[PDB]
Design a protein around this ligand. Sequence first.
Ligand SMILES: C[S@@+](CC[C@H](N)C(=O)[O-])C[C@H]1O[C@@H](n2cnc3c(N)ncnc32)[C@H](O)[C@@H]1O
Lengths: 119, 119
Amino acid sequence: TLVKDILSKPPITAHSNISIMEAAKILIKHNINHLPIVDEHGKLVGIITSWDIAKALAQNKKTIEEIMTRNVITAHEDEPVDHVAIKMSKYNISGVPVVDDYRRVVGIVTSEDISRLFG
Amino acid sequence: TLVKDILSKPPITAHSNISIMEAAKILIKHNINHLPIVDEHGKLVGIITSWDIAKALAQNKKTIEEIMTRNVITAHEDEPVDHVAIKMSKYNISGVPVVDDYRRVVGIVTSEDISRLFG
Ligand SMILES: C[S@@+](CC[C@H](N)C(=O)[O-])C[C@H]1O[C@@H](n2cnc3c(N)ncnc32)[C@H](O)[C@@H]1O
């Protein structure tokens, strides 16, 4: 079971220059809790969840780039699913962006996406 | 093991008239993702998570009352811990406020609390 295999839908990403409100609107619109942030060239630079929306409000930040998590735990398109599951238990995270060798975001894998593949 | 036997900290609550930003500050300060909302008597009236903070910002809500979830599953201090775990699975929830005879909040049990004891 590789990752590039189990991807079912397009990636949803955002740029870092956007407001906290715009980011929140994106989460709600797509009903997602993980939003990979890409630069103007489509390359991964960070990640946002609803926790970071709360954190931005608490720290009085205006843009996503001031609050996004910059050390992103990722999976490779050619990576095995079990390794991703272990990554997610180890770091206690529930979503990992899937990247290629050029750092483009090809999708995202969640712990619900995985929950299916084990049960 | 009753609920009262596993509570390890005081309750953390907020009033319904506080701003979205002020609620967000409470979540971040205490590193919690569930915030029971109470009235002037301390009676449970709702609950918020960081997801609700995001929802509120997206919708330009001003206070917590405008976004809080009012349909809140609870536990009593004298309820078996296992019965709380059963509720979490049954209603697909991750945080259960613990209430007393006046419906005041005396603590909260989370999914992580359960996994730490019984995972
Ligand atoms: C308190 S931790 C708990 C993790 C929880 N699953 C969440 O949604 O955030 C919250 C932080 O995890 C970070 N985070 C979530 N997924 C991540 C990932 N794949 N790589 C790096 N950081 C991540 C987010 O930036 C957020 O600020």
